[PDB]
Amino acid sequence: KKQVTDLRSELLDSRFGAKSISTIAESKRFPLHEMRDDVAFQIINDELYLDGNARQNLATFCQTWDDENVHKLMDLSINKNWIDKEEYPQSAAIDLRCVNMVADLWHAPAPKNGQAVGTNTIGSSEACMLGGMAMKWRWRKRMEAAGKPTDKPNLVCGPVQICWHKFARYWDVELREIPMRPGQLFMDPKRMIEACDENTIGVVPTFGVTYTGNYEFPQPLHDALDKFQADTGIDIDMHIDAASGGFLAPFVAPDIVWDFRLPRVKSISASGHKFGLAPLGCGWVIWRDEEALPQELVFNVDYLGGQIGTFAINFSRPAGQVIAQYYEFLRLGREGYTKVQNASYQVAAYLADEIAKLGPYEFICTGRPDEGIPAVCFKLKDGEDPGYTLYDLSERLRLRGWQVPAFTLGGEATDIVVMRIMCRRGFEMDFAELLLEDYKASLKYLSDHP
Amino acid sequence: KKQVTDLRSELLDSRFGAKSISTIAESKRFPLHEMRDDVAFQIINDELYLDGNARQNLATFCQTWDDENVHKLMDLSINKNWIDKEEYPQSAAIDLRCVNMVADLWHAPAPKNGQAVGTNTIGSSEACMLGGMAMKWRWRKRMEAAGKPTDKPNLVCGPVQICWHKFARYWDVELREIPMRPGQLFMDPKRMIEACDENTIGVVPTFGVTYTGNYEFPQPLHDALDKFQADTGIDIDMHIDAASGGFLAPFVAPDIVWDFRLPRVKSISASGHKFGLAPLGCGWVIWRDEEALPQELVFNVDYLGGQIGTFAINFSRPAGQVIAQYYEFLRLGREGYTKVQNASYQVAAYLADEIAKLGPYEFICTGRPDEGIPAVCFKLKDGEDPGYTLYDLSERLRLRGWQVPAFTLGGEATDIVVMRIMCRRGFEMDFAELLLEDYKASLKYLSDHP
Amino acid sequence: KKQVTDLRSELLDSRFGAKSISTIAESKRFPLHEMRDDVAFQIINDELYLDGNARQNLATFCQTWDDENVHKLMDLSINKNWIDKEEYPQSAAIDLRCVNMVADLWHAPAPKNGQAVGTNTIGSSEACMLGGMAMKWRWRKRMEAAGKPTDKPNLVCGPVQICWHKFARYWDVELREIPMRPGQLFMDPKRMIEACDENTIGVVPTFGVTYTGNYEFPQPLHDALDKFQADTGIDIDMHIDAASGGFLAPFVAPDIVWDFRLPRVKSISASGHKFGLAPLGCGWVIWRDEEALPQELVFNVDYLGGQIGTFAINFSRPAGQVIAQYYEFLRLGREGYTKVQNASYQVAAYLADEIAKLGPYEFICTGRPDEGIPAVCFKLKDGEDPGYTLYDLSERLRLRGWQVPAFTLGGEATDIVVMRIMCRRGFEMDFAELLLEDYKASLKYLSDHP
Amino acid sequence: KQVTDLRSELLDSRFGAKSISTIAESKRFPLHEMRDDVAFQIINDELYLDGNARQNLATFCQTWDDENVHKLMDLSINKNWIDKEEYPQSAAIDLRCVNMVADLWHAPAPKNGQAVGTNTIGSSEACMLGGMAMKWRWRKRMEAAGKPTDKPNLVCGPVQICWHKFARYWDVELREIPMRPGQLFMDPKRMIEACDENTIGVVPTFGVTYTGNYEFPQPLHDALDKFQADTGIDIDMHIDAASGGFLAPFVAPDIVWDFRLPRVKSISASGHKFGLAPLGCGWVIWRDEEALPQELVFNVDYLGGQIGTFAINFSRPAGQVIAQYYEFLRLGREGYTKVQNASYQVAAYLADEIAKLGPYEFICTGRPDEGIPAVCFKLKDGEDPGYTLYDLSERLRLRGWQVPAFTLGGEATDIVVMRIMCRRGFEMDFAELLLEDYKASLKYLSDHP
Ligand SMILES: *Cc1c(COP(=O)(O)O)cnc(C)c1O
Ligand SMILES: *Cc1c(COP(=O)(O)O)cnc(C)c1O
Ligand SMILES: *Cc1c(COP(=O)(O)O)cnc(C)c1O
Ligand SMILES: *Cc1c(COP(=O)(O)O)cnc(C)c1O
């Protein structure tokens, strides 16, 4: 009799009065029985409230808002496999159009066969790894042509994102990172060259440093590499990590020469899901030409009577993000992207100007299109003590749901603590003004409770 | 006033009467201006009709259907970044629970500290690469402990999926793939041993061969490695590529000893988005214990007052797939997965039995849970010419929307042409009956057209 | 021409690239012009993120979750006017049914004419004011019957909610609120009698004290009032403020005699939107019989050829909440309400037990259905200093989005600080465990920072 | 049998189910839980017995809301208006509205940047708040003069029922000037005749419900000025602008009815009437801090500070105020003017067309300078077209229209009038359908006794 009465309750009980929702969710072993689908969904939906409100997460560089058409395109493509070119041929075609468009945006030389050399990825990490492998292979071929050993490769870079550290570790390459230091939180030409030698597989400038938000300019570095070859005969290539800058500079600062306009730039990577406005799960890596991508790294697959070259670390994955990316390209175009990015810079500039009035801060990034990305980065003026640290301010802001990271820089600037505010699409002026209000209140509090 | 007149039309024109929809979509350069969002969506939505219907794609192993709750969870998580453990802490916690559940499902030794060693990935490709890197590292340590050189590593395997070829290429490991041959379309104990030597970083049995759908049983191979170490002193580990098998056997054939129950198995990988029932973009790799995973490959990140180890190639990416995976685990449990997988095997078995009476066929896979995955694989009997090849049949079926692949096997069986039908969730008996009807019709046509 | 180009942009610009979203929302003067409706919605939608997550708000007693059918009924009733009985006659009829059901739930004498004496209200506040006006009127009639003056009315009560202070102020009644004091945080029989006199219009027990979560039991007070009349000839009525308790005890503690089973109780009020499970905007007040409600306070209106009595402060208002309330009565019934409330009590008891293990606490409320509502209320043991105050704990929990109030009691217990956690529908066990985890984490932090 | 019935409970269709084979409970709390789809279906269905809101021409309240308001309301279904610290932005948004409405009514610019006023569930609560403040200011005046305060009275014209309730609930003698032939409102002469030192204030109705016409505060204000000059008695006003408050500012700005008038200490209006907000939104604004007795305000902590609160209700939905703010930003003066102009155009059209159909005498014809967008008429005195307006109202109801016909009060109880309200959502084309049914109804009433 109990079984039937229990089952009756299973059918009729409300979501929160149900027996199945009276226990803590499994966290150690694979569940034994099936359960009400509404209760399973409810529990998980509710647990996710413990994640931070994405729109208030001012620490991330990734998109936290997508328009309705992208939501639809994503749902519609939830089961389209990006890797199966023959099974989802139009998704594949759309992908190839994006490759052309991004290559064009970065001034890659026009492809004679009508198709640029490059590929979509899950993000900049995979894109960078692909660029790094190609870089390492081109170096090997150069050394082999010279009759020199290829067992001690190194890579020269500045304050790179962690993915390059993983590349170095995973592909056994010695990472030679020029450390940040007071006065120059980036890789300068002089220190770059001092780290270069015949075993350097390449140099990686970060066109939009994550820690500060400022651009490392490839041109001055390119000049130094030209002189290095003239003096030593050593020819070093560049791969630009433009995770953020790749989808900013072309629109608001087109005259900064950082891309394929520079001879030594053999490849560039960027995150479509950062300022490229695509939903999480989209990255891009373009090569200046076929010569820049070693064929031994490319796996060809049948496609519409012919073949297409593939270079990826991942295999199966959703094609929704690239479809969404194409949508943004067509819907916004240069005009639309410029308007959206200009909106972010205006917000960044506004906040930097207003926050400067509230305390003894020294700004590292103030939302200037010509210097970096739409971000605000600052620190307390040396020797100044307003009665609080940027860590305390970060915490107070969190009480209102905002995630504004405060952290120490690296290298020779480990004693410097900075606060960074990322101004992405969806962080409109009105919304940013609310942050400003909370910022003033927080300081107000820290003042009444020193 | 033509500018005012064009604008009026731009505002009032219907979807297909609009001037902006009168041209072919851009495919070579980045668009210059923005356009109506409905038109951009319509064009792309319509182009996607050229992709094959996913529900009729019987070539793929990946999920082509997800329940409504998964669609909701995915939409809700479109902007949750899997990599930001501190910003989306509960998404991170849910992921850690799945790691424990998958490890438990595969009989991994119980975690003393309550947390299994493993990670979520975009798919089995990344999971296999993580497993391979760890294998390579353990091998180098083993060689180094005996003062031996580590410049000639090789990996022994059978008819593996392409990701293993990419692993060998990207990490400079010699792939010793034992080829399929008549009467033996798998890596057998004897040939495996012939291929193994002091430079073998490990053996990778494929617990669910893509080309045939059959399991390569680790147990017999394991006994062979034990004897190998006894005779030569060479101790070789195994990594199971259970992309499909990992979420099948545990439910429908629990007595098959293929997992951590086997001492030499140091890691196992599988695709959540294949038989794990997760939406595209979910993979898993678990290690036996801490000793199985070299700490040098792990990058720790801050997490709730402590630190969490991370081992991944990708960085930013959506957390929706793992959240959906946890939902399936809780909603279905062993009971639910058993019922779902059983339905797939029932369909495969049905098709195999029905197709067998329509022609002179020899089956390689008939949907037997004790032999492999829910698939049907067959070829024309040796020396039989029914007046058509399986290529013709595959083509006829495509006229009704079905994608049923016909292909030649590799290795020393390149003369053999086989047809494979994958029976996934969402390919119910009634739907399969329709395929059967189209099969009978196709054969009649081929008959009336020798 | 500039106007044409501006118009083109107003039409084609994306949500965040639009000019109209580049400024701060008006807050001082009525706007002059119209603007894109999507921008207006976006700005407001985004500002609301600054409100606390209702599901994590553990301070409120009101519903923070409604099932899909309620969301539908509310949307369908958004334009139905509760006050227009003749224009929306069935909404009116449904409302009258709820009056009957609530009256019956509280053991009101069965209405001979089939319709209980009572009315729906926006909340307990209006309900309490209606009950208060009626009490005042009956008192005046009693005094007048003996030829005595009615210029000095007073109301006797314990730690009441603010609405009674407002009633006293708005209707010129001296509020004799018996203060909380160490050992008895409630109105006890002895002090109640001390405060009562010929000028007392009635006694108001709070069946579910907001500050502690405990019930003030009407029966012992009723016994005292009986003896009081016997000793002094002064006959005093009771009005039970059962804002919370009215939809709890009837289901989980039917043996508690607090309602119309007690002769002196002439009216009872409760919040439908608290434990009554109705969405915000629903309250109830029921009178014992016609004699308990002075007709001079009732305004009759035409209804279906007859007349219905109305007693309300508000006039026009949505009928969705009462329609939703009826749906909950029908869908859940006594069985459903019992299970939902049982779930809340289960959660309160769990947290009480677990939190007790974390520090030197003295509990005031532990979620016992025989003592009060599903709440947890505690203070630090007298003389114990764990290194932090409950205010500190409340603040740290807020860093995770939780709103757990810490406050000082009133009256003679102003030096006592307590923390109160409300366990409502939608605060399931699994969700509560997450809170407990943050509680443990918050304590560890407070210890690591003496 | 247990298992048998359970199987049916799981598989039965909505209408084949056992639980829907009986009449819904109406006497006692149901005992058992039941299928949620059946419970919903039953209620959804009996609600069809309510009149179609879009065809309800008797109500002044909104019967249509745009998609964004529907969304905002669903999103705010659980946001508690009263918990200022818990839903701080909802509260902030509310305060912006207070400023905007105060500005709309020419309230003196607040030096501290925040107007004195509050959102309410409707005009009823707003009027009661204004009434209490009015009563308290009067008490303070009498106490200063050293006179008794036990006999307060309130002077008004044909007020809505809420003022009768205020009078009863707060023990104030209501001195209502009755309507009479040719004067369906409170005129200056009769107002003054009812005023004395016990009058707590005067309440002009800027948009009389029964007729749709405005009672103009200016001439009444002039009479009160003269009254003080003559007697020394200083009487203030509270304008009940339930309807007019969100009409005149947009279509007839030159009418001086608001804070431009010195004696107007407070004004109330229904956001859910012509303010275009969904049901459950009212407003009351005071001209300054001095007009609102502090003894009536309960301060609550708010963002490190305190905010004064004056309300009868406590917990309630914040959706309506959020929706109200959306309309303010989305429409602005331009938008409201366009929306209100549309209603007046429809009211004027119907008045003109209905005039051609019978011997009617119009009381209201949708003129922006005279009142709200309504049509009100009666049969010419001594004229008998063979039917009453009651019969006409009934026949229109056969098509789903609710067009009320009723008798006026006071000295005009023998007068029967019909009133048509033209709100947002009663577009020209829709109104033309009503006109077609009106013509048909008359034609029918003609071929019959
Ligand atoms: C499909 C498959 C893979 C690749 O897994 P993804 O999820 O597509 O990256 C690897 N191994 C085997 C045996 C497979 O079937
Ligand atoms: C964010 C970032 C990355 C990693 O890109 P993903 O899209 O997260 O994989 C790499 N480099 C830089 C400079 C970045 O900012
Ligand atoms: C919450 C509460 C009230 C006020 O009820 P509302 O529904 O918010 O108006 C009154 N009394 C008690 C005891 C309460 O808890
Ligand atoms: C409708 C009305 C009221 C009552 O306002 P509610 O919003 O329904 O509470 C008061 N006065 C007048 C003049 C009205 O028209």
Side-chain angles (χ1 to χ4, degrees), chain A residues 136-191:
Chain A
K136 188 182 186 187
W137 258 250
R138 290 196 309 270
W139 170 75
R140 285 184 176 175
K141 292 185 176 187
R142 192 199 74 191
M143 292 299 260
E144 288 174 354
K148 301 179 182 186
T150 62
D151 58 329
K152 301 302 182 181
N154 66 72
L155 179 293
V156 176
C157 62
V160 297
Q161 199 262 350
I162 196 66
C163 71
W164 287 105
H165 284 267
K166 299 190 180 187
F167 169 72
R169 172 54 54 63
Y170 301 159
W171 274 275
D172 308 306
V173 175
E174 174 183 308
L175 189 67
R176 291 184 179 180
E177 168 173 31
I178 285 61
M180 301 179 127
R181 62 181 180 178
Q184 65 180 190
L185 312 171
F186 54 87
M187 164 176 61
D188 55 292
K190 189 172 186 296
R191 287 189 298 164

Side-chain angles (χ1 to χ4, degrees), chain A residues 46-47 55 339 428 430, chain C residues 13 46-47 339 428 430:
Chain A
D46 296 345
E47 282 194 1
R55 303 295 300 293
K339 289 181 176 177
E428 64 272 36
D430 186 64
Chain C
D13 285 356
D46 296 338
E47 297 199 345
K339 292 176 176 177
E428 65 265 52
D430 183 75

Side-chain angles (χ1 to χ4, degrees), chain A residues 314-316, chain B residues 61-62 123-126 128 161 163-164 206 208 210 241 243-244 271 273-274:
Chain A
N314 299 296
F315 199 67
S316 292
Chain B
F61 283 48
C62 303
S124 276
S125 185
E126 172 174 35
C128 286
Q161 198 259 358
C163 71
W164 286 106
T206 297
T210 59
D241 176 343
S244 290
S271 303
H273 56 223
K274 288 191 189 206

Side-chain angles (χ1 to χ4, degrees), chain A residues 95-392:
Chain A
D95 164 275
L96 294 175
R97 296 185 189 177
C98 288
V99 172
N100 280 343
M101 300 184 161
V102 174
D104 173 61
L105 188 69
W106 298 339
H107 293 95
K112 56 184 178 179
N113 66 14
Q115 181 61 54
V117 179
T119 181
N120 172 258
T121 59
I122 274 290
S124 273
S125 187
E126 169 175 39
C128 285
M129 308 288 198
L130 299 182
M133 272 193 283
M135 177 156 51
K136 188 182 186 187
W137 258 250
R138 290 196 309 270
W139 170 75
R140 285 184 176 175
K141 292 185 176 187
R142 192 199 74 191
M143 292 299 260
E144 288 174 354
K148 301 179 182 186
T150 62
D151 58 329
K152 301 302 182 181
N154 66 72
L155 179 293
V156 176
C157 62
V160 297
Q161 199 262 350
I162 196 66
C163 71
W164 287 105
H165 284 267
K166 299 190 180 187
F167 169 72
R169 172 54 54 63
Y170 301 159
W171 274 275
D172 308 306
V173 175
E174 174 183 308
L175 189 67
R176 291 184 179 180
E177 168 173 31
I178 285 61
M180 301 179 127
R181 62 181 180 178
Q184 65 180 190
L185 312 171
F186 54 87
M187 164 176 61
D188 55 292
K190 189 172 186 296
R191 287 189 298 164
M192 172 187 75
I193 293 304
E194 287 172 352
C196 290
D197 60 30
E198 58 179 40
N199 294 314
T200 301
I201 71 173
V203 171
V204 178
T206 299
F207 196 53
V209 178
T210 64
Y211 315 101
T212 66
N214 294 312
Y215 294 140
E216 286 199 312
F217 295 101
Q219 186 172 284
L221 303 171
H222 194 291
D223 288 343
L225 291 181
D226 290 332
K227 184 168 186 296
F228 190 61
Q229 196 181 324
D231 301 332
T232 69
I234 300 171
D235 188 1
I236 297 174
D237 299 312
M238 304 176 92
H239 168 89
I240 308 296
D241 179 342
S244 290
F247 287 110
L248 287 163
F251 306 116
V252 305
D255 296 322
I256 298 180
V257 185
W258 65 274
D259 50 30
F260 292 121
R261 275 173 282 181
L262 297 174
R264 292 180 187 280
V265 172
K266 303 309 180 61
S267 57
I268 302 173
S269 57
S271 303
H273 55 222
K274 291 198 188 198
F275 295 89
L277 309 186
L280 277 176
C282 188
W284 297 102
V285 57
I286 303 294
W287 281 272
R288 74 179 298 112
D289 57 41
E290 300 188 316
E291 205 79 0
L293 175 56
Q295 50 192 292
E296 25 281 332
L297 290 171
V298 179
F299 284 68
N300 288 335
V301 298
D302 303 312
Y303 183 60
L304 303 177
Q307 289 198 306
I308 174 181
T310 74
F311 185 28
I313 287 180
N314 299 296
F315 199 67
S316 292
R317 62 192 182 81
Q321 293 85 343
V322 64
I323 293 171
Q325 179 81 95
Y326 185 57
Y327 162 76
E328 296 299 324
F329 287 175
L330 295 186
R331 184 266 180 280
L332 295 173
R334 286 177 184 277
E335 183 194 347
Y337 270 78
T338 303
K339 289 181 176 177
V340 176
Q341 313 302 35
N342 275 163
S344 290
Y345 280 109
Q346 287 300 309
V347 170
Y350 174 69
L351 291 178
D353 188 60
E354 295 293 339
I355 297 176
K357 305 176 184 181
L358 305 174
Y361 313 127
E362 178 184 1
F363 293 74
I364 294 173
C365 189
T366 60
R368 289 182 57 57
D370 64 329
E371 316 184 324
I373 70 178
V376 184
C377 182
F378 59 102
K379 69 178 195 61
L380 294 173
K381 295 185 176 182
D382 300 322
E384 299 290 69
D385 175 43
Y388 62 75
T389 69
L390 297 186
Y391 289 122
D392 300 312

Side-chain angles (χ1 to χ4, degrees), chain C residues 1-48:
Chain C
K1 177 182 177 185
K2 177 194 171 191
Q3 179 169 53
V4 178
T5 62
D6 287 320
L7 185 52
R8 169 179 172 288
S9 290
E10 297 188 62
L11 171 71
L12 309 176
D13 285 356
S14 67
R15 189 67 56 69
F16 299 95
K19 179 176 183 179
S20 51
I21 204 167
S22 68
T23 58
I24 299 168
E26 179 67 33
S27 62
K28 305 172 187 173
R29 292 169 157 286
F30 205 97
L32 202 176
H33 296 293
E34 319 177 302
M35 62 175 279
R36 277 172 51 166
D37 55 6
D38 65 311
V39 170
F41 173 80
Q42 191 67 57
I43 293 174
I44 297 175
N45 175 84
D46 296 338
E47 297 199 345
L48 296 173

Side-chain angles (χ1 to χ4, degrees), chain C residues 315-316, chain D residues 60 122-124 127 160 162 205 207 209 240 242-243 270 272-273:
Chain C
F315 200 67
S316 297
Chain D
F60 285 52
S123 274
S124 188
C127 284
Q160 196 261 354
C162 68
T205 299
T209 65
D240 180 345
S243 293
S270 300
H272 57 219
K273 288 196 188 198

Side-chain angles (χ1 to χ4, degrees), chain A residues 39-114:
Chain A
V39 174
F41 170 77
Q42 189 65 58
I43 293 174
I44 296 174
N45 175 82
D46 296 345
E47 282 194 1
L48 296 174
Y49 284 136
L50 272 295
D51 273 346
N53 177 299
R55 303 295 300 293
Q56 283 185 287
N57 182 342
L58 305 182
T60 185
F61 284 51
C62 303
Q63 288 303 304
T64 50
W65 187 85
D66 313 280
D67 79 1
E68 181 167 56
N69 287 324
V70 170
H71 277 271
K72 298 177 178 177
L73 286 174
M74 284 295 276
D75 186 72
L76 174 79
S77 312
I78 194 171
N79 305 310
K80 290 175 178 295
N81 198 337
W82 185 87
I83 201 68
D84 294 336
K85 315 299 178 184
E86 208 67 346
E87 293 162 40
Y88 303 93
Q90 197 48 38
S91 285
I94 286 173
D95 164 275
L96 294 175
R97 296 185 189 177
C98 288
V99 172
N100 280 343
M101 300 184 161
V102 174
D104 173 61
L105 188 69
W106 298 339
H107 293 95
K112 56 184 178 179
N113 66 14

